[PDB]
Every structure is written in C-alpha cells, then in structure tokens.
Amino acid sequence: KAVWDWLILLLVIYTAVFTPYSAAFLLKLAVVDLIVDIMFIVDILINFGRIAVHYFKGWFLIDMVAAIPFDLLIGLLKTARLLRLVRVARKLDRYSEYGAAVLFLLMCTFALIAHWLACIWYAIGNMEQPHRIGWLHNLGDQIGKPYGGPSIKDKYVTALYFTFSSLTSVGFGNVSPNTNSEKIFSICVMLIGSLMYASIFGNVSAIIQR
Amino acid sequence: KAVWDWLILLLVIYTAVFTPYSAAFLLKLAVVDLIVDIMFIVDILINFGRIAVHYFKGWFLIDMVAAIPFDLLIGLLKTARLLRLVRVARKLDRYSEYGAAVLFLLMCTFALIAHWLACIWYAIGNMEQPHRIGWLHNLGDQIGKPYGGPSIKDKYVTALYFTFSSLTSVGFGNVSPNTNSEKIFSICVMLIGSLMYASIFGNVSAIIQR
Amino acid sequence: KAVWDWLILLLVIYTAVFTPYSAAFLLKLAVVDLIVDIMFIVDILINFGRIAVHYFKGWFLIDMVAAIPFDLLIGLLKTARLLRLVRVARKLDRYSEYGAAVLFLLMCTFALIAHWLACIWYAIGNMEQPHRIGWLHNLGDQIGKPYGGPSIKDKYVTALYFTFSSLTSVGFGNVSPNTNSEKIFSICVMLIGSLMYASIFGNVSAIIQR
Amino acid sequence: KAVWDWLILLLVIYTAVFTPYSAAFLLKLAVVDLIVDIMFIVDILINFGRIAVHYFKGWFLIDMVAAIPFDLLIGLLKTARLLRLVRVARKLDRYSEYGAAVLFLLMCTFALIAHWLACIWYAIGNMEQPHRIGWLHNLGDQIGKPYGGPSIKDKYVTALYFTFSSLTSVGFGNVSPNTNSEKIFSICVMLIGSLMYASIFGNVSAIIQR
Ligand SMILES: Cc1cccc(CCN2CCC(C(=O)c3ccc(NS(C)(=O)=O)cc3)CC2)n1
C-alpha cells in the first residue's frame, strides 16, 4: 500500500498517454492493455469489512464504469478508461508532499495537455484530409512524401511539435492553420495556453523560489 | 434585481459583440437587436419619485443617448449602442463576489478586445483592398478562393485568429502585416497587447491563488 | 518653474526621438531643432549668486557639452545632444510622484528603446549597399518596389515594426535576419528585450495595482 | 583569495564556452587551453597538511578527473573538462553575495545554455546532413552558399540565433525544424526553455527591484 499509490499514478499516466493516442491514431500493445486492466481490477478489489459501504457511496460507480471492459465502431468506447484520472484527482493529498513530485506532476500535466491537443489536432486534420489545404498535405509536401503520405510517427511528431509551439507561443511558422476548423481550434488552443501559462508557469516560479 | 443585473450584463455583452461586428462586416437577426433595445428601454423604465430627481442629474443622460433609435449613415450612427458598456462598468462591484466570475469576466474582456481589434483589422483591410499586397488578397490566395474572394465567415475567422495570435504573441506567420497602415496598426496592437495582456493575466494569476 | 520641468521633459523626449532619426535616416525641420536648442540654452541660463559654484561643481560640464553648437559627415557630431536625456533622470524626483506619469514614462522608455533599435537596424541594413540578401532587398520585393527601393516612410515603419515584433517576441515572419551582422544584432536585441521584459512589464504589473 | 577564485570563475566560463564548441564544430589555439589547464593544476595544488585529508575525502577526485590530461572518440574524451563548473557551483556563497553579481551570473548561464543548445543543434544537423530537408541545406540555400556550404562562422551564428529565438519564444521563421530528430529536439528544447526562462527571469525580476 505504501508504494501502491505511486504505481497507480504511473498506471494512470500510462493510460492517459496511450488511450487518446490509440483513439486518434491507431483506430484507423494489447497485452499491456490487459495487464493494466488486471492491475486496476486488483486496485478496485483492494479498495474494498464495514468500510465497503463508504466506498459504495463514494467513488465506486466511477471506478467501476472505468474498470469494466466494453468489448463485445466499438473502438471509440475505449475513451471511458480516461475516467481513471479521478484516482489521481482524489488522491492529491499524498501527491503533494515533495517539491520534486510537484515539479514532475506539473510537467506531466503540461505534456499530457499537449498530447491530448495533438491528438485532437490530428483528428481534425485526418477528418478533413479526404474531402492541399490541410496541414497533413503541407507536412507531406515539406518532408518529401507527397500524398501514401507521412508515416504515423511523422504525423504524431508534427502534431505534438505544433501543439507545443502554440502552447509555448513560439509559433515556428513551419505548421500554420489554414482551414476554418483549424483556425478556430488554434484560437481555442491559444486561449487554453494563455490560461495554462498564467497558472502553471507562475506556480513553477513560485515553488522554484522555495 | 440581481437576476436583472446579470441579464443586463448578458445583453451588454451581446451588444458589445454584435454592434461592432455589424458596423465592420455586415454594412454593404435585426429582430433580436430590436428585442434587446426593448429590454434596455424596460431597464431604463424600472430604473426609476424621490430617486428620480437624483438620477436625472446622474447617468440618465448617458442612458438616454444609448437608448434613442437613430432610424431616420444610419449604420455607422448605430454604433452609439456601444455606450451601454457603462451600464456594466458602473456596477462592477455587483460582479466581484463569486471570485471565479472575475476570471470569467477577464476571459470575456480579453475575447472582446480581440474581437474589436479583429473588426478594426478587417476595416483597414477592406478600406485598402479596392485600391498581392494586403491581408485579404493573401488570405484569398491561401484559402483557395482567389479574389469575390473569401466568404464573410473566412474573413472574420482569419481576422480573429490573427488578432489572437498578435495579442498572445504567437505570430503564426500565416497572416502578417504588409502595408503601412497594417504595420502601424500592428505596432499599436503590439504595444496595447503587451500592456493589456500583462495587466489582465497578472490579475488572472493573482486570483488563481485564491 | 512650476511647469518648466514638464516642458523640458517634452523637449527632451523630442530630442531623443529626433536626433537618432536624423542621424540614421535623414543623413543620406531645422527651425524646430534650432528653437529647441535655444530653449535648452534658456533653461540652463534660468536655473543658474551663492548657488553658481554649486552648478559649476556639478552638472555644468555635461549640460555645456550637450548645448554648444557643432557648426563650423560633420553632422554626425550632433548626436552628442542625447546627453540632455540625463535631465529627466535627475528630475525623476518629481516625475515619479504620479502613477499615471510613471506608466506613461515606462511606455515612453519602451517606445524609445524600440525606436533607437529601429534606427540601429536600419543603419546596419544600409551599411550593406556595396554588396535577395538583407532585409532591405526583401522589403523592396515584398511591397512591390524592387531596388530606387522603398521610400523613407516604408523603411522606417518596417524597421520599427520588426524591432517591436522582436522585443515583444512575436516574430511575424515578413522581416527576419539573413546576414551575420543582422543575426548577431538580433541576438543582442533578444537579450535586451528579455532583460527589459523582466523589468518594464513586471514593474507595470506592480504599478497597475498601485 | 577572492581574486584567485574570481579568476577561476572566469576560467570556468572560458572552458564552458570553448569545450563544446571545439567538440562539435571543430571535430574535423592550444596555447590558451594549455595555459588554462596549467592554471587549474596550480589551483588544485593550492587546494592541497592538516587539511589535506579533508580535501582528499571531498572534491579531490572530482577535481582530479577533470584535470588529468587525456593525451595518449579518442579526441572526444576532452569533454570531461566539463566537470569543472562544480568549482563555481560549490562556492556560490561568494559569487552570489552581490545582487549585480547574481544578475551577471544569470545572464551568463542563460547565454551558456543557449551556447550548449546551439552545439547540440549543430551536432544533430551535421549528423543528418550527409544522409532540402535539413536546416543546414536551407541555411546554405538562403545565405547564398548552396551545399561547400556555409562557413563555420555562419553555421555557428545561425545555430545560436535559432536557439536564442526558440528559448525566448520568438520563432523568427528563418530556421524551423523539418526532420523528426529536429522536431523532437525542438520539443525538448521548448520544455527546457519554458523551465529555464521562467526560473531565470523570475529570479531576474526579483533581483531588479532590489
Ligand atoms: C509562454 C507563454 C505561454 C502562453 C502564453 C504566453 C503569453 C505570455 N508570455 C510571457 C512570457 C513571454 C516571453 O517569454 C517573452 C516575451 C518577450 C520577449 N522578448 S525578447 C526580445 O525575445 O527577449 C522574450 C520572451 C512570452 C509571452 N506565454
């Protein structure tokens, strides 16, 4: 139990990294998914004898709905496993004792927001690709693989790099929104990044000043 | 009356959004504008026998100027409705108790400043267009609609996206000033955005701690 | 003498604005500059028997060397008039009483640094006359006036706009250094702008609350 | 004694500047670094009979490994002289006594981080070059030196300018990543730049008001 919470935090990080990635990119390893589901089942079993009634009124419903496999496009239902983040949200008391832990958690949240926005950006680009104006076509032209098209690794790296540059307000000019949906998404990302800097990069300075 | 105050704030936000838009874009529904005008007349009616003399020498002239209809250019004279913003600026104390409502108001005023600057940017672009130089011609080339050029949706979205990038200091490089009026406007927006952005988001970071 | 300090401040701002501009751009009105020099001579005269030795011991040398006419590329010596800028520094005792005055003065210093860096940037870009390389040739190509070349208005506005984009860290994309001297100057501008952003726009965030 | 270790700080800055530059750009004079290592041998002799065992227990081995000559990948082993900054890290009491000294040291470490990132960026670009995609090819085609190729001066200046623009979040658009390795390096540099820029310049803004 002493190291169970940090293992669950790592598990939540893994699923937060690889669930939106699998939804956006790979939908078009399984054994690791089965292993992590088994570990979360073990966790919920441990969570349970006069206190089980308290758990039932508490977070039992959310953990149960996030732990039940949905196998019977059914692949979009796997998003429900993103509900495991409530475990980290509710156990913040233990995850706020060390300064290095707080720094690592802040970078984890920053990288996760960038990753989720990258998945959304690729979703938009791939939705609009079939119907020379989108960012995917320009990327393929500028990396020497005209639309075939860029490999999945190239698309993910470009999406993450664009999202990081927009969040950090560098705006490299390599990747620029050109369609109305891309422009509106970029406006939303600019607003999100403004709020995220005002919070996170003030907190980081304040707790480095410690 | 508190519900009435919040309703008046909502209508003031609506007019601050839709009268500069109509002045900049739509010149060359209205029933909602008429309804809002009737609601504002209702507000100036409920505003009022002992206190009537007190208010008559107060803001009443300002409210009257922003309430009279100029339906005898009429379109540019209809911009007098922007004076209703004092109806919100004069009782901001009623909008400073929730704490998070102040954050919402700061986000709203940042978005409103961006929208007004977008309308000014489009006004400059349209006043220069008839005379490959200019943001409208470049936008028409990029978007795939060479100059009748881009639709009003594309023009407004591009203007708002450019203004947001300039205020947030991203500088995407998709749209960039190229004419002397555009360059001077961009210098003014750079100064104004630095000053505002710094003030607004310093306040936002301050209220995040609470 | 009650309002003489503010008038002298306006004259100092004028000379700071217009001496580097004449040194860089116009070298290739006189009456206003002559009137300003006469007014500065009047200023040193009026503020001059027990206290004469006090002035002789103090700022007499700097005030004198910044007031003697240089008439006899000899106009390059007129840049010594920038030593009059120390008068606002030594009268910051009174110029700092009002918060609005402090904010206006901070914006003035920011704009003056941008203007001086614009003059230096144009000077650097104009040293490369003997040599599609350099910001002046790119500027001429962009605005449809290939080298003739752009007018002095276009050159000054473009230099000021590039300097403002660099200092604020927007980097619009039209103007970008392409020569080792330009790149090194841009690195220096980035260092100076980081130093001033840490100073000017932290002090502004402190001042606004005050 | 203070003059001695301030000279040692200057020597440490010299070697931190000139070790990665020689390791990366000149992999294809020795009197200065011979003098520097002789001076550091003199320093290790000064550092040492009662206290000799005290130093032997402590920093003796760290200072010895960074001072032993490596003459006998063979030329790459000289990067071990980059453990010498522990000399200035271990004695921050003197170096941080003055506020102006801390300001100068913060500027120096920011410039050093930019220099190291420039060396890494050039190493990546050079390892990718012999395989219009790389940044070196674009630099050569934009500077007027088609790939021969740009001189070492041009390559170093361009790398340093790109690194400074990325750290300061300008993103000029002249140099932008176009390969997966370059994009990953840029993402990591954006995270690093956010952290170091925020920490360093929060410290700077704390210092200036003092
Ligand atoms: C990082 C980040 C994420 C989201 C929003 C903003 C907006 C506020 N955010 C403050 C730091 C600024 C900054 O880092 C900077 C400003 C001016 C500079 N001028 S200069 C000549 O390049 O040194 C350099 C850096 C950039 C804007 N930010």
Side-chain angles (χ1 to χ4, degrees), chain A residues 1-63 65-92 94-153 155-210, chain B residues 1-63 65-92 94-153 155-210, chain C residues 1-63 65-92 94-153 155-210, chain D residues 1-63 65-92 94-153 155-210:
Chain A
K1 169 58 82 161
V3 308
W4 185 247
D5 275 327
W6 271 282
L7 184 69
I8 282 294
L9 166 59
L10 262 69
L11 258 283
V12 160
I13 279 172
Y14 154 80
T15 170
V17 164
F18 284 94
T19 318
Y21 176 89
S22 267
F25 288 92
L26 299 189
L27 260 206
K28 293 179 179 179
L29 192 53
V31 68
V32 194
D33 167 77
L34 322 192
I35 275 145
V36 304
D37 213 38
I38 278 306
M39 302 262 275
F40 273 109
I41 272 298
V42 153
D43 156 79
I44 187 142
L45 207 45
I46 294 169
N47 235 31
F48 289 121
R50 64 221 171 290
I51 202 67
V53 293
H54 185 257
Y55 183 32
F56 260 76
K57 189 46 198 180
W59 321 83
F60 171 71
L61 65 161
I62 292 201
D63 288 73
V65 81
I68 169 69
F70 285 74
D71 70 325
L72 321 173
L73 184 64
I74 58 104
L76 188 61
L77 271 306
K78 316 315 163 191
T79 279
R81 323 201 180 299
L82 268 158
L83 289 171
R84 314 171 151 161
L85 262 156
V86 313
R87 292 214 190 65
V88 168
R90 85 201 202 203
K91 266 181 204 52
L92 269 150
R94 185 195 221 89
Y95 305 139
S96 180
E97 208 267 4
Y98 306 84
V102 177
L103 263 63
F104 175 75
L105 252 54
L106 281 198
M107 300 275 147
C108 268
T109 68
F110 177 25
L112 283 181
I113 293 159
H115 179 61
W116 298 335
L117 289 163
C119 294
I120 297 166
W121 171 254
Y122 170 78
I124 289 168
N126 192 48
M127 151 185 158
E128 310 176 329
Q129 201 269 123
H131 65 53
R132 74 281 191 191
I133 302 293
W135 74 273
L136 289 171
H137 294 259
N138 310 335
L139 152 72
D141 285 7
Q142 77 188 14
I143 67 177
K145 284 172 291 203
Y147 265 80
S151 180
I152 295 279
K153 147 187 264 293
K155 289 191 279 218
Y156 177 58
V157 173
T158 299
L160 187 54
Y161 144 84
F162 169 91
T163 289
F164 260 104
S165 85
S166 313
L167 278 163
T168 52
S169 75
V170 184
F172 271 110
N174 222 26
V175 189
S176 46
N178 192 293
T179 319
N180 263 347
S181 322
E182 290 172 15
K183 273 167 185 155
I184 297 173
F185 169 82
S186 195
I187 292 159
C188 289
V189 164
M190 283 190 271
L191 207 37
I192 281 170
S194 290
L195 269 60
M196 201 196 77
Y197 157 86
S199 322
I200 301 195
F201 289 156
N203 277 342
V204 152
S205 299
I207 81 195
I208 275 295
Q209 284 175 3
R210 166 268 313 154
Chain B
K1 189 182 171 71
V3 167
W4 187 253
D5 278 338
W6 292 107
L7 263 284
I8 277 289
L9 160 77
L10 185 46
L11 296 189
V12 154
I13 280 170
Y14 160 85
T15 166
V17 163
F18 270 90
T19 74
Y21 175 88
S22 34
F25 293 89
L26 306 160
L27 295 174
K28 313 182 320 204
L29 318 97
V31 85
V32 191
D33 258 29
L34 164 140
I35 291 199
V36 168
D37 230 329
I38 305 303
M39 301 265 298
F40 267 101
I41 303 164
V42 155
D43 177 274
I44 202 46
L45 211 63
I46 165 160
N47 184 257
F48 295 126
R50 326 161 292 110
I51 205 75
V53 188
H54 173 207
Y55 197 68
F56 197 95
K57 232 42 173 198
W59 271 268
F60 175 82
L61 82 173
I62 278 176
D63 318 298
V65 170
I68 57 190
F70 303 82
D71 292 53
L72 288 108
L73 184 54
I74 274 69
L76 75 96
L77 200 50
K78 206 52 64 191
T79 48
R81 306 225 203 95
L82 271 170
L83 172 83
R84 304 205 270 235
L85 301 203
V86 317
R87 201 84 43 79
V88 152
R90 81 174 185 232
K91 84 202 81 183
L92 68 171
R94 264 291 310 111
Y95 315 125
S96 325
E97 77 296 336
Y98 281 5
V102 178
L103 266 64
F104 163 82
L105 249 55
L106 284 169
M107 173 269 251
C108 194
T109 182
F110 185 71
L112 277 180
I113 288 166
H115 174 71
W116 297 333
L117 294 176
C119 292
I120 295 171
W121 173 251
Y122 172 79
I124 281 168
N126 214 27
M127 100 167 186
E128 293 185 343
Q129 178 226 320
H131 309 321
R132 34 189 181 286
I133 310 326
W135 77 277
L136 278 164
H137 278 90
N138 299 353
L139 155 72
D141 286 19
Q142 295 166 353
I143 208 86
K145 294 202 211 93
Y147 257 102
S151 307
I152 304 283
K153 192 195 202 305
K155 283 187 271 219
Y156 176 64
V157 171
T158 309
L160 186 52
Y161 143 85
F162 166 85
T163 292
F164 256 101
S165 96
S166 313
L167 293 169
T168 49
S169 95
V170 179
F172 271 113
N174 212 52
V175 179
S176 53
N178 205 9
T179 319
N180 276 341
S181 325
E182 297 179 7
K183 267 167 187 157
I184 297 165
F185 168 81
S186 200
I187 299 158
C188 297
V189 169
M190 272 187 266
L191 272 151
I192 290 319
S194 82
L195 182 80
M196 301 315 198
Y197 204 97
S199 276
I200 290 189
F201 283 94
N203 301 355
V204 155
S205 100
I207 318 170
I208 273 292
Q209 323 208 59
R210 326 167 181 158
Chain C
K1 187 61 161 68
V3 308
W4 183 251
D5 290 336
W6 293 106
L7 183 73
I8 271 289
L9 166 77
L10 281 194
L11 301 184
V12 175
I13 271 161
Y14 160 88
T15 188
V17 163
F18 277 93
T19 314
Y21 179 88
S22 325
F25 289 86
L26 295 182
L27 218 31
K28 204 162 261 163
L29 202 46
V31 56
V32 190
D33 264 10
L34 191 38
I35 273 180
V36 170
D37 321 328
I38 298 314
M39 271 275 268
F40 270 103
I41 280 160
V42 153
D43 162 84
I44 170 184
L45 163 154
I46 171 177
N47 89 9
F48 218 50
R50 64 187 173 88
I51 212 75
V53 60
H54 182 205
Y55 201 128
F56 263 80
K57 172 60 214 82
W59 270 279
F60 183 79
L61 164 71
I62 280 183
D63 275 8
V65 304
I68 73 88
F70 295 93
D71 56 39
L72 51 99
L73 85 177
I74 58 174
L76 210 29
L77 281 293
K78 273 62 170 183
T79 190
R81 284 161 151 61
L82 281 158
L83 292 153
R84 314 221 280 271
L85 267 160
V86 75
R87 294 197 195 182
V88 315
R90 54 211 281 281
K91 305 244 201 262
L92 272 194
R94 74 151 51 201
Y95 299 148
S96 147
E97 272 186 337
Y98 310 151
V102 174
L103 215 32
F104 166 73
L105 252 52
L106 261 199
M107 301 315 287
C108 274
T109 67
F110 180 58
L112 277 173
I113 300 197
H115 171 54
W116 293 337
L117 286 169
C119 296
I120 296 168
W121 170 254
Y122 169 72
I124 291 165
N126 211 50
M127 311 185 168
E128 328 187 3
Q129 293 177 335
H131 148 280
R132 51 173 64 184
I133 304 265
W135 76 274
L136 274 168
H137 292 68
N138 309 353
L139 161 69
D141 293 348
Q142 283 170 3
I143 65 170
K145 303 168 146 238
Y147 270 81
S151 211
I152 301 280
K153 190 188 172 206
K155 285 187 277 215
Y156 174 67
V157 174
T158 304
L160 183 51
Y161 143 80
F162 162 84
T163 295
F164 257 106
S165 92
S166 309
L167 295 163
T168 304
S169 77
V170 181
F172 276 106
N174 282 15
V175 191
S176 46
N178 212 347
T179 308
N180 287 340
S181 44
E182 289 176 12
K183 277 166 189 153
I184 292 168
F185 169 80
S186 198
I187 299 164
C188 298
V189 163
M190 286 189 274
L191 274 151
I192 301 170
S194 268
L195 226 52
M196 299 327 178
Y197 205 80
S199 273
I200 284 170
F201 290 136
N203 263 340
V204 154
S205 55
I207 279 274
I208 47 162
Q209 162 62 84
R210 183 192 297 185
Chain D
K1 181 60 152 61
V3 295
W4 173 250
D5 61 31
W6 276 100
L7 166 66
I8 283 290
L9 164 56
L10 257 206
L11 286 143
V12 154
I13 282 169
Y14 161 88
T15 188
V17 163
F18 279 86
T19 323
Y21 182 94
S22 187
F25 291 88
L26 297 125
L27 170 163
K28 265 303 151 183
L29 291 169
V31 63
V32 201
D33 89 324
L34 278 155
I35 289 156
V36 167
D37 65 53
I38 283 321
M39 187 142 319
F40 267 118
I41 288 304
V42 152
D43 168 60
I44 203 48
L45 170 141
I46 270 176
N47 272 344
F48 312 120
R50 54 208 150 289
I51 36 173
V53 55
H54 173 209
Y55 187 46
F56 282 11
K57 152 71 200 175
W59 306 95
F60 184 69
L61 73 165
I62 303 186
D63 253 17
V65 62
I68 47 184
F70 291 133
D71 166 40
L72 51 93
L73 187 68
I74 47 179
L76 201 162
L77 192 83
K78 271 145 65 55
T79 171
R81 324 171 41 71
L82 231 49
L83 325 158
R84 302 232 283 268
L85 318 87
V86 317
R87 218 79 62 85
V88 311
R90 81 156 80 112
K91 59 190 50 161
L92 272 203
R94 195 162 322 72
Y95 301 147
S96 59
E97 161 251 321
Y98 282 121
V102 183
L103 206 29
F104 164 73
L105 260 287
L106 282 181
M107 284 345 273
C108 262
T109 181
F110 177 67
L112 279 171
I113 282 162
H115 176 76
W116 296 333
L117 291 174
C119 294
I120 295 169
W121 169 254
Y122 175 81
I124 287 166
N126 207 15
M127 98 158 164
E128 281 186 349
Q129 199 278 308
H131 296 335
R132 324 156 270 100
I133 316 300
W135 76 270
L136 287 166
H137 289 268
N138 293 267
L139 162 67
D141 293 348
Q142 88 182 22
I143 207 91
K145 284 192 211 183
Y147 253 97
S151 325
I152 298 277
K153 170 189 209 224
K155 285 188 275 217
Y156 176 64
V157 170
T158 308
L160 185 52
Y161 142 84
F162 165 84
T163 278
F164 259 104
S165 87
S166 312
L167 289 171
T168 47
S169 76
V170 183
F172 275 105
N174 253 28
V175 176
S176 43
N178 220 54
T179 319
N180 298 352
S181 312
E182 296 178 13
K183 279 168 183 159
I184 293 168
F185 169 82
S186 200
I187 296 162
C188 291
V189 153
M190 275 185 290
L191 274 161
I192 277 168
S194 76
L195 226 50
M196 321 285 198
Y197 200 100
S199 316
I200 280 166
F201 286 96
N203 290 334
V204 159
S205 182
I207 296 195
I208 57 184
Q209 336 174 21
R210 308 320 61 61

